[PDB]
Design a protein around this ligand. Structure first.
Ligand SMILES: [K+]
Lengths: 120, 120
DNA sequence: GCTCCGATATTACAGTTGTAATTTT
DNA sequence: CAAAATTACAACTGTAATATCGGAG
């Protein structure tokens, strides 16, 4: 009946899951621990949560649960970014891009690259 | 050690206060209720919370409170977006921009608008 | 005086999230 | 010191309800 969301800490599990396509909590724990610095009890909880929310699902490979995504990366990211831009920016997308630009956040080469992603 | 956040509902009040520069709780309530439909008991609560977190301050005008922001809009939105993009996009800004191009579809007008902003 | 009102303050209560520890299998 | 499920628990959020203070009468 209710829709759920991916929390900020949950984005890390998701990203890792997407990277590995198919992975135990352990596989995921090792990786996250190279980046961020969290307890395996923590990472395991986040996993559980994503699972109860139905963002991820699992199969038992030889006794151990493997986790995989049930939502497509680009779709949910966009969905998310679209939602973020709307709460923060009254000007929408262009406004965001303008904000990043006036904060010299983009290098000459970067502006180059974006003009190519556009020039499609 | 405490740093506070602006919550999702709160970005509504914050934007109104930045537009109006100077507003009473009632000003703000009247404005929000045009767009979104929230109780004033809610809006007042969020103004209070934003006040207690130190994002907005107030001086009294004929016994009525006038709220104003203490944080520079462009900095805070930028800092916020920098945070969001990094948690969601392993590829950062350009990854996000690409994501919209491959998902969203808008005219050569919009594509130009951006190109005009990038170009500067 | 105290009386009623709108502005402001205090309080409520559950769902989400960060950050885990304890229990079961 | 397993892996997985259960429980913990305060802070932060959404979403208000209720209580009270300072003036217009
Ligand atoms: K950069």
């Amino acid at each position: 009946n209710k829709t759920y969301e991916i929390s900020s800490a949950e984005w890390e599990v998701m990203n890792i899951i997407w990277m590995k396509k198919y992975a135990s909590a352990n596989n995921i724990i090792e990786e996250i621990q190279m980046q961020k610095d969290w307890s395996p009890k923590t990472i395991r909880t986040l996993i559980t949560r994503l699972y109860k929310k139905g963002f991820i699902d699992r199969k038992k490979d030889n006794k151990i649960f493997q986790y995989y995504s049930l939502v497509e990366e680009s779709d949910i990211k966009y969905k998310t970014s679209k939602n973020f831009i709307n709460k923060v920016y009254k000007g929408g997308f262009n406004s965001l891009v303008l904000n990043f630009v006036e904060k010299e956040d983009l290098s000459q080469d970067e502006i180059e690259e974006l003009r190519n992603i556009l020039n499609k």
